[PDB]
Design a protein around this motif. Structure first.
Motif, PDB file in Angstrom:
ATOM      1  N   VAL B  27      -1.015  -9.313   5.525  1.00 11.64           N
ATOM      2  CA  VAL B  27      -2.843  -9.799   6.494  1.00 11.64           C
ATOM      3  C   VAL B  27      -3.498  -8.870   6.835  1.00 11.64           C
ATOM      4  CG1 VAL B  27      -3.671 -10.749   8.571  1.00 11.64           C
ATOM      5  CG2 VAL B  27      -2.402 -11.849   8.016  1.00 11.64           C
ATOM      6  N   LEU B  28      -2.300  -7.549   7.355  1.00 10.10           N
ATOM      7  CA  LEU B  28      -3.931  -6.444   7.956  1.00 10.10           C
ATOM      8  C   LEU B  28      -3.795  -6.014   6.397  1.00 10.10           C
ATOM      9  CD1 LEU B  28      -0.978  -4.511  10.483  1.00 10.10           C
ATOM     10  CD2 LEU B  28      -3.738  -5.372  10.803  1.00 10.10           C
ATOM     11  N   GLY B  29      -3.385  -5.805   5.190  1.00 14.00           N
ATOM     12  CA  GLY B  29      -3.519  -5.397   4.145  1.00 14.00           C
ATOM     13  C   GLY B  29      -4.844  -5.938   3.493  1.00 14.00           C
ATOM     14  N   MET B  31      -6.900  -7.191   5.489  1.00 14.26           N
ATOM     15  CA  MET B  31      -8.109  -6.657   6.452  1.00 14.26           C
ATOM     16  C   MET B  31      -8.237  -5.770   6.103  1.00 14.26           C
ATOM     17  SD  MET B  31      -8.700  -9.113   8.825  1.00 14.26           S
ATOM     18  CE  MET B  31      -9.059  -8.001   9.662  1.00 14.26           C
ATOM     19  N   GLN B  32      -7.561  -4.263   5.424  1.00 17.63           N
ATOM     20  CA  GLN B  32      -8.478  -3.595   5.224  1.00 17.63           C
ATOM     21  C   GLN B  32      -7.991  -3.820   3.737  1.00 17.63           C
ATOM     22  OE1 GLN B  32      -5.671  -0.193   6.287  1.00 17.63           O
ATOM     23  NE2 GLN B  32      -5.756  -1.223   8.146  1.00 17.63           N
ATOM     24  N   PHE B  33      -8.206  -2.980   2.727  1.00 16.57           N
ATOM     25  CA  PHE B  33      -8.461  -2.644   1.428  1.00 16.57           C
ATOM     26  C   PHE B  33      -6.727  -1.821   0.608  1.00 16.57           C
ATOM     27  CE2 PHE B  33     -13.118  -1.758   2.072  1.00 16.57           C
ATOM     28  CZ  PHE B  33     -13.126  -2.934   1.735  1.00 16.57           C
ATOM     29  N   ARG B  34      -5.920  -3.526   0.916  1.00 13.71           N
ATOM     30  CA  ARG B  34      -4.681  -3.145   0.215  1.00 13.71           C
ATOM     31  C   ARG B  34      -4.102  -3.933   0.188  1.00 13.71           C
ATOM     32  NH1 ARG B  34      -1.638  -0.703   5.789  1.00 13.71           N
ATOM     33  NH2 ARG B  34      -3.062  -2.468   6.332  1.00 13.71           N
ATOM     34  N   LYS B  35      -3.466  -4.682  -1.024  1.00 15.06           N
ATOM     35  CA  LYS B  35      -2.262  -5.601  -1.272  1.00 15.06           C
ATOM     36  C   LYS B  35      -1.199  -5.258  -0.734  1.00 15.06           C
ATOM     37  CE  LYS B  35      -4.953  -7.014  -5.458  1.00 15.06           C
ATOM     38  NZ  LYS B  35      -4.677  -7.687  -7.110  1.00 15.06           N
ATOM     39  N   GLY B  36      -0.640  -5.203   0.207  1.00 15.09           N
ATOM     40  CA  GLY B  36       0.653  -4.044   0.816  1.00 15.09           C
ATOM     41  C   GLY B  36       1.614  -5.358   1.625  1.00 15.09           C
ATOM     42  N   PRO B  37       2.749  -5.914   0.531  1.00 11.28           N
ATOM     43  CA  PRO B  37       3.193  -5.475  -0.299  1.00 11.28           C
ATOM     44  C   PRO B  37       3.550  -6.786  -0.899  1.00 11.28           C
ATOM     45  CG  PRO B  37       4.270  -6.346   1.417  1.00 11.28           C
ATOM     46  CD  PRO B  37       3.379  -6.564   2.381  1.00 11.28           C
ATOM     47  N   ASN B  38       3.022  -6.064  -2.937  1.00 12.37           N
ATOM     48  CA  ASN B  38       3.022  -7.547  -4.004  1.00 12.37           C
ATOM     49  C   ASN B  38       4.036  -6.999  -4.469  1.00 12.37           C
ATOM     50  OD1 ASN B  38       1.588  -5.573  -4.535  1.00 12.37           O
ATOM     51  ND2 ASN B  38      -0.615  -7.141  -5.070  1.00 12.37           N
ATOM     52  N   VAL B  39       4.349  -5.383  -4.785  1.00 11.58           N
ATOM     53  CA  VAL B  39       5.477  -5.054  -6.090  1.00 11.58           C
ATOM     54  C   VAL B  39       6.023  -5.307  -6.201  1.00 11.58           C
ATOM     55  CG1 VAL B  39       5.224  -3.039  -7.427  1.00 11.58           C
ATOM     56  CG2 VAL B  39       3.223  -3.617  -6.419  1.00 11.58           C
TER      57      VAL B  39
END
Lengths: 68, 299
Positions: B27-29, B31-39
């Motif tokens: 959710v924080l990811g 909120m920013q521009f992050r796909k963290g984590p998905n890999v």
């Protein structure tokens, strides 16, 4: 010919204003709608509590008639 | 069957807190521009599981009895503090449970002070002493506001509370009291903007986030929810769970946005802004049922 990187005849301007909408309600309107929904909740609360007391008195009468 | 009830409570606390950590990180990811984590695996589930495993295989080093006794108290609070939470049929029908909430929050303050004493004479322990002071400056506000929001409910039994929430929500008769109480939940969870602050870090971390889920479930029960229809309680369970989830996402979402206070600004703000306003709202809630002739059915 020469092939530098010039601007083509002049470009458009880009703004430099602190563009702020400051939208939303005022003090009086937000204040009044909050207190109005508050008083609405109070009236419905009063109604449910007194009808609930009626039913709880009926429960008291059940234990009275049950006892001896 | 009762130990089976206990196991069905305290086995999903591990999965609940771990999946809470992946949810808050994702959710924080976003909120920013992050796909963290998905890999790392399918949408990042084995990453918190195996990362918890790696945190258990860290091999740390080192008063020893105190260092034992602090996180055991923290995590046994994190276990033993979902008992009367009335997902429709609670585990123990306590006659009073909200005062038990207050008492075990004070036990969490014990936990923090014991960890600070075990930290072996450090500027960190001075900071942890200050954190104990700020954490203890909140159970006044929480108890008094909780007292007022149960005052419109008669009894401490909390089943009466689930009776009271049928017609309208209790968020409407007390919204600013609820606002101050939710800020006090942010306060008791010891997270942003209310900060700062070795091992076993997994168990201590587990204690903090189970405390978060407890405060959000108790928030959701205290102010809103749905109706307890018997012979299909799962409807109330689903609607309660959805509302508690949205509130916890909002809770981390408010954590995602603001810088953290100054310590003395935190004390200044707490006393000189919440504490007279608590007293004034509470005396108005005392004089309210005598001026509406609606005192709740204290059975």
């Amino acid at each position: 010919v020469k092939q530098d990187m010039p601007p083509v005849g002049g470009y458009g301007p880009i703004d430099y204003k602190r563009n702020l909408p400051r939208r939303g309600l005022s003090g009086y309107s937000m204040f009044a709608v909050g207190i109005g929904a508050l008083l609405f909740g109070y009236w419905s609360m009063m109604r449910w509590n007194r009808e609930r007391r009626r039913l709880q008195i009926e429960d008291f009468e059940a234990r009275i008639a049950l006892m001896p | 069957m009762f130990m089976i009830n206990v196991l069905t409570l305290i086995i999903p606390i591990l999965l609940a807190v771990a999946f809470l950590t992946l949810v808050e990180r994702k959710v924080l990811g976003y909120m920013q521009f992050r796909k963290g984590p998905n890999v790392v695996g399918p949408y990042g589930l084995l990453q918190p599981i195996a990362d918890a495993i790696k945190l258990f295989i860290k091999e740390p080093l080192r008063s020893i009895s105190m260092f034992i006794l602090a996180p055991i108290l923290a995590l046994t609070l994190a276990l033993t503090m979902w008992i009367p939470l009335p997902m429709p049929y609670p585990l123990i029908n306590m006659n009073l449970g909200v005062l038990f909430m207050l008492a075990m929050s004070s036990l969490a303050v014990y936990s923090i002070l014991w960890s600070g004493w075990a930290s072996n004479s450090k500027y960190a322990l001075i900071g942890a002493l200050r954190a104990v002071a700020q954490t203890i400056s909140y159970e006044v506000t929480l108890a008094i506001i909780l007292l007022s929001v149960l005052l419109m409910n008669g009894s401490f039994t909390l089943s009466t509370l689930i009776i009271t929430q049928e017609q309208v929500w209790l968020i409407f008769p007390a919204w600013p009291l609820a606002m101050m109480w939710f800020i006090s939940t942010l306060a008791e969870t010891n997270r942003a903007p209310f900060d700062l602050t070795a091992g076993p870090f997994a168990l201590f971390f587990m204690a903090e986030y189970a405390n978060i889920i407890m405060m959000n479930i108790f928030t959701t029960t205290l102010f809103l929810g749905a109706f307890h229809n018997p012979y299909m309680p799962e409807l109330y369970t689903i609607n309660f769970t959805i509302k508690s989830l949205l509130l916890s996402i909002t809770f981390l979402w408010i954590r995602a946005s603001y810088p953290r206070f100054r310590y003395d600004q935190l004390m200044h703000l707490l006393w000189k802004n919440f504490l007279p306003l608590t007293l004034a709202l509470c005396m108005w809630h005392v004089s309210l049922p005598i001026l509406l002739s609606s005192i709740p059915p204290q059975t």
